[PDB]
Amino acid sequence: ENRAQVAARQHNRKIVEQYMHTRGEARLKRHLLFTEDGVGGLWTTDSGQPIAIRGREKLGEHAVWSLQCFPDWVWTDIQIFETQDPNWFWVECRGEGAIVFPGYPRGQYRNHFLHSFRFENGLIKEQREFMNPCEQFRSLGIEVPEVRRDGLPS
């Protein structure tokens, strides 16, 4: 069983690496790193509900959109964490690029990210990204509310 666990972890790490380094036109094929029922998406949004893209086909369709609205996106400062689960990885990184979001002025978006990758049978079953949406608000020209700190110590 330890052999099976070890085997899984090394292959899955390569897939996380490939995902995090997928750039440009290659993003159109990134969904091939998922299971047929794989899910990806953004877990931290203004509404408090995740935005999940469900299914390898819908993920492939969505990459076409992502290529237009984040045309030069790169992940940077990539740190991949294996865990005691050979099928679960976490990634700490930054990301940056132009943001061309429908209905908003073209801007530049930079943020810190955490990604969760869960695997099934050698491919990604669930990818989740977590960030501070306040930085995406700023990139879109949306006013960020400020918590009053006057009464706080520091």
Ligand X SMILES: O=C(c1cccc(Br)c1)c1c(-c2ccc(O)cc2)sc2cc(O)ccc12
Q: Give the footprint of ligand X on this chain (CB under 6 A).
A: 41-42, 45-46, 51, 53, 65-66, 133, 136, 147, 149, 152-154
| SS3 sequence of 112-142 | EEEEEEEEECCEEEEEEEEECHHHHHHHCCC
Q: What type of residue sits at position 75?
A: W
Among 28, 88, 98, 125, binds a second copy (CB under 8 A): 88
Q: Which of residues 1-40 bind a second copy (CB under 8 A)?
A: none
Q: Does 118 contact a second copy by CB under 8 A?
A: no
How far is C-alpha 9 from the chain's CA centre?
A: 20
Number of residues that bind a second copy (CB under 8 A): 44
**Residue 21 CB, nearest approach to a second copy (Å):** 19
3-class SS at 94?
A: strand
Cβ closest to ligand X, residue 4 vs residue 147 = 147
The tokens describing 97, both together, are 């690029």
